[model samples]
Target chain A: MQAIKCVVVGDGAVGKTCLLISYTTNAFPGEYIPTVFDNYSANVMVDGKPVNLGLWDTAGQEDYDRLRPLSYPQTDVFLICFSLVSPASFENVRAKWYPEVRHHCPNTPIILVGTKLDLRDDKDTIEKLKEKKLTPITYPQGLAMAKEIGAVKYLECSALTQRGLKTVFDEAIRAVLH
Target chain B: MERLVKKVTSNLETELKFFKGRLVQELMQIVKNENGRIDHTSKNWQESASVLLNSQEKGAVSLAEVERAVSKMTQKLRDQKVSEEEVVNIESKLKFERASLEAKLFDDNEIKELINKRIKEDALRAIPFLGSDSESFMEKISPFVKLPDDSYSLLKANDKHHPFQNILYSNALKFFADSSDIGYLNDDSLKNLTPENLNAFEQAVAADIDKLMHHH
Candidate 1:
């Protein structure tokens, strides 16, 4: 079986670890623990061929800005994630994350992921953003941003509900193989 | 002019002290929240504060450095097999403290003040050349203090100074012109400079400077 090194980059609390845990274990982790850096491995069949998918989780806080890129080298693919409900995080994808990743690995393919898809239409979340004169980012906005940043794919998922979760990792593996 | 310098310097010193005190408080808070009734007055606690203050005085204390310090301390506690929840609790406290510190200290306002003071000093130096009528010279030059953004743009476009340097010059002039004491030009004053007033102020200053130089 071949190995694919997939590294996740995004703002903190955007559910990078949750996405991985839900995919790898089928059960969501109950609490958020800020990751310094953590790695997980899973053997999965991608198009009937066994592949060892190595998942790397990184911290997105400004405190980790210098340290996070230490995991970027030799990355087969990158999942640049943001929360659909966090306009700031989405903005940072363009403003900070993409530039940081491309600075380190210029040729690496990126899957632009909008995590927390379940909350995009949640009543409370919408009302909260409305108070701030903001709302959940639409799918079209994510797609347009992905295109603007030259990402290989645009994806959205709810790590809590596992909606569109498998495809995110599967597409990541495929992006490398292709 | 000497009073202005003294005032600005005192303000900077006071701000730095407040910043350092807050950092020490945050560090101590982290220790107490985790260790439960630890001797805060002990030599160890004082040493930790000294280390943090040393890093800060060197201009290297950031949220990351603070986080790394706390993480290392937590790891030491974890070596004793401390509960996961305790480590998590300490981590949350550190996060909260980091956010608070960033909000209070790292807004670049101090840099703005330093730049303002430097520009004021430069302007004061030029006053001596206006033939000893210091009050009239000050009044004459007051109109020449260009708006900060315009000055910043001119400086940046001309490649005469770094962007931040330009910001300092422009901001300094704007604040100095508006306040009798630069110390009075706090965050509220900075925030209140509407774009309309800002550009008008900068243009008036720039225009005044051109006239003064021609007269000289």
Candidate 2:
């Protein structure tokens, strides 16, 4: 019976679009397709109350820096995302993303999202990070970052496997209600 | 801060004025080219241009909205039987208009700054090594990198083949082949790497190979 706007922001290629697509379509897009600006709407029931959830996907590339914030006004919540396997993207949670979002919508609640959870323990992923003297960001690390940044919640999901995926949007709706 | 805001607003106004003038000039050219041939498509284009000009007069206009308006007008043109040349001309003019606005917003200096920042950020992300190392690492592990079949062949031909790189790539490929949870390397993941990071990277590859050997 209410509407909530959840805008997702993160570094390019960190799976922000995938997270939304998988949740909305129930299918994982097999390839990376960079988003410019897109919107999706779903009628979701949160705790038995119907809600119109508007998902806004903004381009994270610096090319769209001037345009991205156009989608931020009136947002009810923000999903600040990073790839669990990308330490650099994770670092941007503080360095770039947080500052940008806060600058635009200082009062909107933010949910810190660690995407690509399925890769956190994959031997190939682990070994790849090992090569760079890095490791997949662990759960504790994600939660610690969430706390440090004052996120309302820290969530992890894998769009590929649909693991912990539904709960992400569900929690998003809940965050707005709360 | 107030002065800064005023400065930005003034710059934006100047840019918008330039954009509106160019748009009007382009639209007039389209009408002139038509030479008094009145059609549904021509009328639609004129209406779209008027709407754009009117919207700008009211307040700040969004590029997205402008594109949408153009698209709607073009769709109307398509529904009618617009000549291919006429449609092409309209599309080209609109494209030029959009490009001009984009150029104004993203000047060369701003673009260069953005690129340099990305390069620096990427270099930092490819931590534990220098730029040269990451380049070589990418080269060495080319086989492990995913590409379309045709592109893969082109890459293989163009790349200077290295046995050690092959060894590392093959080992990782075999090791990860059966793992369902594995994620492939994409540009974002690899952009930050350098050859300096390759020592630890090589060690990691070597260790994985050793583990596979022990398992076998």
Candidate 3:
């Protein structure tokens, strides 16, 4: 059976691996052990169709520069992960990762995931935070970038709370398969 | 006379050192926070490594252009005994041009809207340079420095301890230091920046300002 492929990209420590583990296995890895550039993979059947999600948990440090080009090929769906508290991480998605991805795989489906939405104050969630804070380190800005690069679609998901996880996965699957 | 020159040169060198050091510290702070989207909303934020790299290129170009202008002005001064007032006028003109450019980039409604949104989101990240206190110094000096009819006293006024005196010196040093990387000889030039040379440069700059003020 042909499987759908999804690629996760982001700076290290922003919880790309955790999202992978949570989405695929439905369990958190407890604590993260930093993965090498092209470390692990998981296969799941979405809509009764086999889907192979190649989780390229990129090292968030400078050492991964050499390995970046290797990570770019055949990424059908790319999740640009960033944390809510870190504008820098979100920015890296636009500045470093997105352009590179666009250069190599122009038509790939891209989604901007604000990874740690669970950590955001429950009373003042991402939506509320967006309203209160003018820059609103939320979905709108990331979605805007997704639009800029012509991502198939955009969604904000929290790997921690499993918030919006299903919607993100379903969207990726819909984009990738029937 | 030799000793006098050395003493003035040493003083200028020390001042330049202080200025360059401080400016670099400030610029680096902005760059660091802005890098990799760490602070995200910092004025120092450069969006991306590509963008940051591009800005650095633009900055180099800007310094080179300024140096060319300064060099041409200096040559003119040496060739023809341009009065001190004329030099001031030239410097003021540069300042005016810079201010207008800054306004065009930063004060336009669309640009201002973006800045305001960013500022509201992340106050420090919205500005390019973090910890820039030049505006504060400007505010403090505005009242005293603008005593319109006190021209004679203004010239006599000792700027030694003025709030912006060190800042002004520091800015000049930073500008020269940035220029130095592009074969501008900032250290050597500053080392020979004796009080007399400073006076001459100042006089030339002042002449430019006088022309603008008098409009004659």
Candidate 4:
């Protein structure tokens, strides 16, 4: 059984920890904490084939960038996270951080994730999109981007709820298998 | 056939009425909070309420509830002002609970289920409206609109009492709700809005009139 290595890479406070925790532990820890360098492994049968994934939940600060060069070498899949509530995070993922990751791990399968779907209705910083009108338009744009990039897939995820989590991992496995 | 359409339409209308009622209830609360009275026509109450609530939550010190609980405890034990130590202890405990509660309420299954139920109901009503004039209509138009996942989830996870309905109402208009806005260029109404964009609306009107002629 060939092994797959999936790395979750994103800026600070972009729900990378929550995603990795949800995937590995099936739990969401919402509080913020510093992440250290360590690889977590999960073995699963994907598409009827046995594979081991070395899931790395990387730290996001510039201090951690030193470690990324070494870390990016072995990645088979990269879960790039952005939060829609934080338009800055969205821009960072698109303009700065993601491109940097791609430079490091050119061939690795990348999937863009819009995290924190649970906050869709909250009008805290920005206005809540008039219901049912904006979400589908977002989906079309996300799907179109995925099609354009030839990435593994695009998804909106809620680490708090774990929507699209399974599909994300499943697609990564499929990419590796093929 | 006529009877079946009428029966299904009645059932759908009933469900929509319920959905609308729940939304209205939420909006009413917002009106009272902001204006000191629940206004019957304050359609944007939910959005305003959500903004206010989130702001309150963000601005409040983390774990403020823990200090309140400790003060209550200290008052019972010794009748003194809340001590700093006790306040710190309370805040830490409360912070953890707040995170946990937020995570639980906003979980995907819970949020998705609520939106799905409402959208499913909207689709049921919109389907028949589209089919009534297929000669001109090209596709099925649903009344339910697509919401940003977070926005949709917020509506789903909002407490029953708060209702948080402004988001859904706004979304419907943006996504699928029919109005006079597009009626100027085409035969825009409840019938044509759901299935497709502007082009579909025109085709649907033509098909509807053709159906009428055939029947006559």
Candidate 5:
């Protein structure tokens, strides 16, 4: 398993596990290993050869800033994920995650992902943010963040409807082979 | 003046072959007008040797300051009423000191190695998407030149010999016209370059890099 260690980082409960599951969608069925606190291995095929697509998760709690980077040194590529509906999570791409990733591995390729892509257009999603005078991030906003963070690619994905989901992981693998 | 000329004269002519193109042409023009300014004959040889080994002023190599050690020593010896003949003989000894100094200063095969590393660093740093420091450049090419987190990391960035991948090295050479299409100049050959060849090579590469920076 000449797996490219693709580490996924973002705030906790930002759909990292669901995103991981959507990629390996029925490969191991009920045997899907939980990746919240460990490395998850999926023997997935990309561009003909079998790649042991290794997925790593950062303990995104504010307390884990000490332990989070223990897994970061070996990282080949980073999937800096955020939710389109979560404005604060989007802000962390510039604020917290980008700086943290660069401090440890300044040279790794990064792929910026706007997670929960389905909620961006939902009628209640806009109304829920209306209650707090906030708005779900727009696609153009996602593009601009990608540019600011020097990400190789900026992609939008949803773990539920799985829209652009394959492309998300496909782009991640290519970025490692990238 | 005339005595210093004849002793180191032969070695001076051969070493002059390696002078940078502009400097060589300028010196040739001086020799063309050699009839008027014949007194300071061999000082030019002593100075030319200083820069020939300087290797196109590669950042750390500064012929700019004109180190003046030899000339100062020459003047010091003369002030004490040393023989012009004796002073002339001592001039050749200074040439030997410059050779040994060049050996220590330039680190032997560094010219060859630094050029290969510099192109790759320039390529990735010039990407418009990466940071312009050694850390950023090294990050992208770390897949090629793997180093540990200790002194080797410091050594890789601090020194010139940064080993890069062949494909990255091959493509970066496209910035220069000669090595672009020829798949033969791998990182090893480019990094292992040894100087004459290197003096000419670095001068041209340095020339191309200035043009490259303005546009690329």
Candidate 6:
């Protein structure tokens, strides 16, 4: 199995951790581990081929700016993520995340992920957005964002349900493979 | 003799401008070291340049000093301090100065790499038709104009993070991400192409290609 180093970058509390946790473990829970950040290598079957997907978790909280890009050097692909429920976070995909990834590794294939699909559909989430005169990030808006940032694919998935989640990492592996 | 003062510290000045403050001072020290050479002889950039160059004779110690001073300076230049203009200016003179001499430090090949690296980055970002046909795109650019083979290889071998991301990753991005309407760096967003509305545009691509085939 070939090792593929994939870096995940996004805003804080935008379900980036939730996305990785949901994808990595079967019966995953936050109570099991105090903290799971940085390196999490999962040997998995992607497209009927077993590959070691080394998921590199980065600072959604940018405490050490200098040290962050050091993790960027040997990265194969980057997953630039935002919550489908957070329009502000989605805006940062083009504004912050895309620019940061391109600066370090200019040619690395990036995949745009819209996390928290369940919440996007949730009435409570839409209620909060409507209160602020906003709406959940639409499908076309997310696809438009993918095109904006040059992301290989625009994928939306919920960590709660794991809907459309497998295809996210699946396409990421396929991105690095071919 | 008089024209050679410029000649004494000429060829190495351009690229060596990174540690620039010392260039004149060091050359003055070397000039002071060779105070006797210029004063005692009173005759040279023409004859002595050849003396130092073709036959490898004039200011031999100092020209040798050119390689040494730059060796230390280039090490520092490698440690973050850099510029490409100096390299280009130095190369312009150095290439003219030595046709029959040693590689000393900088050569035609090495300088092209030195400054070409500077331009190569911006060059990659600027390449529009880089997705499909990378050839004709570079056929007009400065360094790549003379370097079609090298440009082809350069386009193929991106400076990716891992070896796995060499060419295939770029191909995947072009396939999965890139558009017919615009490049990755486009100022105009993909307004028309959506998850749903591509029926018309997808049909457009088919229609255009069909006409190109059947009509042609």
- How well is each residue in A1-178 modelled by candidate 1, as lDDT tens digits? 2557788888754867567767865744553222222243554655544355667665444543544464565679999999999999899999999999999889999999999999989999899999999988899999999999999999999988899999998899889878
Query: lDDT per residue, candidate 3, A13-112, as tens digits?
Result: 4666556657754654353221222223343445433343444443334433443444455556777777775677777877887887788778877876
DockQ of candidates 1 onward, in order?
A: 0.01, 0.02, 0.01, 0.01, 0.01, 0.01
Identify the superior model by TM-score, candidate 3 or candidate 6.
6
Q: Where is the poorest 10-residue window by lDDT in model 3 chain A?
A: A31-40
User: Stretches of candidate 6 above 4 Å error?
Assistant: A28-35, A47-49, B1-216
The sequence of per-residue lDDT tens digits that candidate 4 reaches over residues A60-160 is 44533443343455567787777755656665766766678778777877887777766755574334544423431256666665565566778887777
Candidate 3 Cα errors over 4 Å, as ranges: A28-39, A122-136, B1-216
Higher-scoring candidate on TM-score, 2 or 6: 2
lDDT per residue for candidate 4 within B83-191, as digits (tens), equals 4465354445445544543443334454234444443332222221222343243233332232233323222222321122222222333444355342111234444
Q: Candidate 2: which stretches are off by over 4 Å?
A: A28-37, B1-216
**What ranking emerges by lDDT with the best candidate at the front?**
1, 2, 5, 6, 4, 3
Can you write out model 2's per-residue Cα lDDT over B22-73, one digit (the tens) per residue? 3432232222334322232454344433443333321123344444545555
Off by over 4 Å in 5: A26-38, B1-216
The backbone clash count of each candidate, in order, is 6, 13, 25, 22, 1, 3
lDDT of 6 at B113: 42
Model 3: DockQ vs. true structure? 0.01
List where candidate 4 sits over 4 angstroms from the true fold.
A28-38, A123-137, B1-216
Q: Of the pair 1 and 4, which is ahead by lDDT? A: 1
Q: Provide the TM-score for each candidate, comma-separated.
A: 0.46, 0.46, 0.39, 0.41, 0.43, 0.44
For candidate 4, what's the RMSD? 23.4
Candidate scoring better on lDDT of 3 and 6 = 6
Q: Write the per-residue lDDT of candidate 6 for residues B1-216, one digit (tens) a residue.
A: 223223323424532332221211211121223321222123322232222222222112223324544445444443543454544444455455344233321243432343233223223323232223333223322232121112212211123221222222232224333454432312232332243333433343334434433443
- Cα lDDT tens digits for candidate 5, B1-216: 445444334333322221222232222222223321222235543343344334332111122212232355467667867678867776665566456545532342332232233334333332221112434333533343321222111122122112222223333344322343333222333342333334443454444444433453
